């Protein structure tokens, strides 16, 4: 272990804020990439399956 020493150099407030913005952007990018590919655009996929469009 010994991984807890990381909080004795990096200020916890900035680490948690930096991690939050990183996590949200990484998630949206994956969601946005899935929407861009027609194979996984779940909104339009449901349109074809349910005879909507």
């Amino acid at each position: 272990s010994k991984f807890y020493k990381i909080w004795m150099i990096f200020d916890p407030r900035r680490v948690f804020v930096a991690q939050g913005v990183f996590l949200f952007l990484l998630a949206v990018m994956i969601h946005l990439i899935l929407l861009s590919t027609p194979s996984y655009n779940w909104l339009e996929i449901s349109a074809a399956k349910y005879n909507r469009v």
Binding site: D11, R14, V21, L25, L32, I33
Partner: protein, 50 residues
Amino acid sequence: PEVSEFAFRLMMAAVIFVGVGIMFAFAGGHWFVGLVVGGLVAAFFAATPN
């Protein structure tokens, strides 16, 4: 290396602005999505140094 924290942040933001701009231009379907997301984060990154 005698580099100020403000100056080092400007170097590191410039990479982030260029970097995150490329990834969101790809995901956003337009380079302007990459600009806003890449620019806003770098504007937030470079304005909060130690």
